Amino acid sequence: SCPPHWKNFTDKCYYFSVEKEIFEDAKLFCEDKSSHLVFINTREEQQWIKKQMVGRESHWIGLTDSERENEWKWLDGTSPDYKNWKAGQPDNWGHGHGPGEDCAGLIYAGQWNDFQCEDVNNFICEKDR
Ligand SMILES: [Cl-]
Ligand SMILES: [Cl-]
Ligand SMILES: [Cl-]
Ligand SMILES: [Zn+2]
Ligand SMILES: [Zn+2]
Ligand SMILES: [Zn+2]
Ligand SMILES: [Zn+2]
Ligand SMILES: [Zn+2]
């Protein structure tokens, strides 16, 4: 069972944030709740996460390429098999995204877009019981 205001799916508790913050601040919020920005590893999970999104706000996910440019990974090191990238992401139609935009976020509709960190957004925290 999950703490209040957290949602359950499978064996994981999810938190859809109310406040918006910088990627690194979002990162630190989940960390101190003993969780981390959400990892999406299956279509079924991705379809569930979307159903939960009532507000149309964009949410940060635990995906970044900051360690090594263009080598997108979940905060646990892993590379995403399953992928739900928007139209020309994350390579930006082959021109390579610009500096700073090394932090991904989910948008209403479900697909992932790579925004620039330091940009403020809502975020999703996740932790496996
Ligand atoms: Cl409540
Ligand atoms: Cl309440
Ligand atoms: Cl996962
Ligand atoms: Zn309540
Ligand atoms: Zn997950
Ligand atoms: Zn939302
Ligand atoms: Zn990058
Ligand atoms: Zn598990």
Swiss-Prot record:
Organism name: Homo sapiens (Human)
Positions of Ca(2+) 2 binding: 65, 69, 92, 101-102
Cell compartments where the protein resides: Membrane
Binding site for Ca(2+) 1: 39, 41, 45, 126
Protein name: Collectin-12
Signal peptide bounds: none
Tissue-by-tissue expression: Expressed in perivascular macrophages. Expressed in plaques-surrounding reactive astrocytes and in perivascular astrocytes associated with cerebral amyloid angiopathy (CAA) in the temporal cortex of Alzheimer patient (at protein level). Strongly expressed in placenta. Moderately expressed in heart, skeletal muscle, small intestine and lung. Weakly expressed in brain, colon, thymus and kidney. Expressed in nurse-like cells. Expressed in reactive astrocytes and vascular/perivascular cells in the brain of Alzheimer patient.
Quaternary structure and partners: The extracellular domain forms a stable trimer. The extracellular domain interacts with fibrillar amyloid-beta peptide.
Function summary: Scavenger receptor that displays several functions associated with host defense. Promotes binding and phagocytosis of Gram-positive, Gram-negative bacteria and yeast. Mediates the recognition, internalization and degradation of oxidatively modified low density lipoprotein (oxLDL) by vascular endothelial cells. Binds to several carbohydrates including Gal-type ligands, D-galactose, L- and D-fucose, GalNAc, T and Tn antigens in a calcium-dependent manner and internalizes specifically GalNAc in nurse-like cells. Also binds to sialyl Lewis X or a trisaccharide and asialo-orosomucoid (ASOR).
Disulfide-bond pairs as recorded: 2-13, 30-125, 103-117
C-type lectin domain boundaries: 9-126
Record-listed a carbohydrate binding positions: 86, 89, 91, 101, 113-114
Residues where Ca(2+) 3 binds: 89, 91, 101, 113-114
